[PDB]
Symmetry: C3
Subunit: 227 residues, 3 copies
């Protein structure tokens, strides 16, 4: 159930909000129309995660789903967060590496499915079926990382050294971080309960703040984002 993890949600909520503040109060005197963009996408990610973590802390983003043979505590807010948050992150990588609108659209449709499917997977009452949805979502995810790692890196080799290198850093970080989510989900309170909801939230809190604030920090503090 949901109560003892309140602390990881409260600390997650705080780091998001400050993460939003620092990024906001940093990109104010930025005139470069490109940087101005990078700040917008990057600043919006924590602003969203903030509202959603806060909803979990206040107990709104928590619902109870019956499966297996019991009433399970499912934090749906996570997906309302990820749904807009993951695409924005993808967009940061795309502008940086200057991706084709056709590939951006594909990655954005791949992503929406990943979360959409992951949300359905978290609310399905037939315990067994949840894993079917987990599969479809993890497949979609790999598609995204295959393109980010191989496809994008290729597009990064035609940009100036600052960009190619910052992209490299960002690329390694998303690929490692992203693949943690599905594992955490599979062993958490949405799949096979091998790990308590207590620790699960402590894990998703580290994985999030790193992917949202961490990632923003790496990028925003480089010159890779200028013309």
């Amino acid at each position: 159930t949901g109560r003892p993890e309140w602390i990881w949600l409260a600390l997650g909520t705080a780091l998001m909000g400050l993460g939003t503040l620092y990024f906001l109060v940093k990109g104010m005197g930025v005139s470069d129309p490109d940087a101005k963009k990078f700040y917008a996408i990057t600043t919006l990610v924590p602003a969203i995660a903030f509202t959603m973590y806060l909803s979990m802390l206040l107990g709104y983003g928590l619902t109870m789903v019956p499966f297996g043979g019991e009433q399970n505590p499912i934090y749906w807010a996570r997906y309302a967060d990820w749904l807009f948050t993951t695409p924005l992150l993808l967009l940061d990588l795309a502008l940086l590496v200057d991706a084709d609108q056709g590939t951006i659209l594909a990655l954005v449709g791949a992503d929406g499915i990943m979360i959409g499917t992951g949300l359905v997977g978290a609310l399905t009452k037939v315990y067994s079926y949840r894993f079917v949805w987990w599969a479809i979502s993890t497949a979609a995810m790999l598609y995204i990382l295959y393109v980010l790692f191989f496809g994008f890196t290729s597009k990064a080799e035609s940009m100036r050294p600052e960009v190619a290198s910052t992209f490299k850093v960002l690329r390694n970080v998303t690929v490692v971080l992203w693949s943690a989510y599905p594992v955490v989900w599979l062993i958490g309170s949405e799949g096979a309960g091998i790990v308590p909801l207590n620790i699960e939230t402590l894990l998703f809190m580290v994985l999030d703040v790193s992917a949202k604030v961490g990632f923003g920090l790496i990028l925003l503090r480089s010159r890779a984002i200028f013309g």
Copy 2:
């Protein structure tokens, strides 16, 4: 509860639908690819408000939320309306003043949060917490008006006189109208019941029709929208 306000919802529904008709049957012989755009965004706002007001009149957009210590009548349809309607309005101002894609994205993310947060605020069961959400939403809103008023106006000074002036009119109107919503909400049936749901709907009906039809009229009837 919801019944005695049926008349403000029925008259709101009518003004929206006619508002859609007049704008539609006005921009038909428009060839200018820019005006053609302004009509599209501007015409869609009332078309949406129509469907949503109609849902309130038909009782679908009304739900009952328990808080404080009673069952409260909450018209959720408003946000399903605003969520797409406010961003479109923002887009009208942006094309007019020729804003950066980075600022448009920021204002659109600021807006989505404002309504998203406002929706959560209207459905939260812990009476006290509703105001927390009200705060976050009103903060987001001010961000939007700060940019519209100071930021955009600045971008309007480099456009031809017709545009700068029409923008001025539009700018004053949105800033005054927008700031009424949060006040109406705070004193209405979603916050502290100082005002009955009866009058509340009469207020939101004036504020809406003015912001959607009124605003469209001001703009659409000027030459500010041409090349």
Copy 3:
């Protein structure tokens, strides 16, 4: 109720998934940045329909709505599908014929309403009112077909012969297919039960696979999609 149509949903789910696979494993060695786009939009349509059909087969996309004087089986998943699927289809026609951003935005707002209204129509408890929503949705739809048929065709006459002709084929197909949905809906289990949910699903399954996979096949297998 929902059980005997499981077979049309299972066969629909399969044709979607394979439809996704074939399109995916076809557009891999495509370098043309335009084709690369057409594949993205076109490939995403079946990928979405897949997830949604699967949700119906697994029973998640089915809900029970009380109206008339009974409990009715309503597959809401259809609209979660159509909402993103129809706009993508519209986008295929638009890029092909090179439409104005103002018209694309109008058709996309027209479409969102059509499904949005159609969804409301399927969940409204006042039997009679459902038809009101059906009307608004069918009106929106005609608007879309009026533009596709007359407006777009006009834009197609200034493209090379391969495009104008492929567009013609695509145009006839969408206009005939699209207009079947509202009729099927009116006589199905969402309106007047003249037809059993059994056959209704067999009809929507043919109409979908044709509109999504069929349409993609026609387009994707022509050179109309290259520069």
